[PDB]
Amino acid sequence: MAARTDNSIVVNAPFELVWDVTNDIEAWPELFSEYAEAEILRQDGDGFDFRLKTRPDANGRVWEWVSHRVPDKGSRTVRAHRVETGPFAYMNLHWTYRAVAGGTEMRWVQEFDMKPGAPFDNAHMTAHLNTTTRANMERIKKIIEDRHREGQRTP
């Protein structure tokens, strides 16, 4: 009934670095290939609201929306959801980090459902999100590992 994506990847670096990089919202435009802009609108208490402005998609359209995000470094997890759902009836995000043999494993899970009349149906969006998510996790993994390996020669 409800759409879902579940993707994992291991980053060959320590939790601290993996966490700090991925949770650096201001840097997402250089980390993610889809976001042109990312700014925190407000930070009240734990969670916070941020705006995302994507780059022109495969159809030349630029999207922008606001989401609420609540990072929990202590539990090594983060929860988020779109405030301006747009074509989505709702979109929930859940990231976890786990120490494993070789580095830090990142697991990103999405829970959503398209609005009746949206350009995409649950099936097609699921495929689209898996593709973009996998591409982003691989790019982020590379970036983090490079920063990590750099600090091993100064040391």
Swiss-Prot record:
Disruption phenotype: In the absence of TcmN, the linear polyketide intermediate formed by the minimal PKS consisting of the TcmJKLM proteins undergoes spontaneous cyclization to form some TCM F2 as well as SEK15 and many other aberrant shunt products.
Range within the parent protein: 1 to 155 of 494
Domain remarks in the Swiss-Prot or TrEMBL record: This multifunction enzyme is comprised of two structurally and functionally independent domains. Contains a highly conserved interior pocket. The size, shape and composition of the pocket are important to orient and specifically fold the polyketide chain. The accessibility of the hydrophobic cavity is regulated by a dynamic equilibrium between open and closed states.
Region (Polyketide cyclase): 11-140
Family, similarity comment: In the C-terminal section; belongs to the class I-like SAM-binding methyltransferase superfamily. Cation-independent O-methyltransferase family.
Protein name from the UniProt record: Tetracenomycin biosynthesis bifunctional cyclase/O-methyl transferase TcmN
Key words, A-Z: Antibiotic biosynthesis, Methyltransferase, Multifunctional enzyme, S-adenosyl-L-methionine, Transferase
Classification lineage: Bacteria, Bacillati, Actinomycetota, Actinomycetes, Kitasatosporales
GO-annotated molecular function: O-methyltransferase activity; protein dimerization activity
Phenotype when changing W108 to A/L: Strong decrease in the production of the first ring
Effect on the protein of changing N136A: Decrease in the production of the first ring
Described function: Involved in the biosynthesis of tetracenomycin C (TCM C). Part of a type II polyketide synthase (PKS) that catalyzes the synthesis of tetracenomycin F2 (TCM F2), a precursor of TCM C, from malonyl-CoA. The TcmN N-terminal domain, when coupled with the other components of the PKS, catalyzes the cyclization and aromatization of the linear polyketide intermediate. Catalyzes the cyclization of the first and second rings. In addition, the C-terminal domain acts as a methyltransferase.
Domain of life: Bacteria
Active site as annotated: S67, R69, R82
UniProt GO BP: antibiotic biosynthetic process; methylation
Subunit structure: The tetracenomycin polyketide synthase (TCM PKS) is composed of a ketosynthase complex (TcmKL), an acyl carrier protein (TcmM), a cyclase (TcmN) and a probable second cyclase (TcmJ). TcmN is a homodimer in solution.
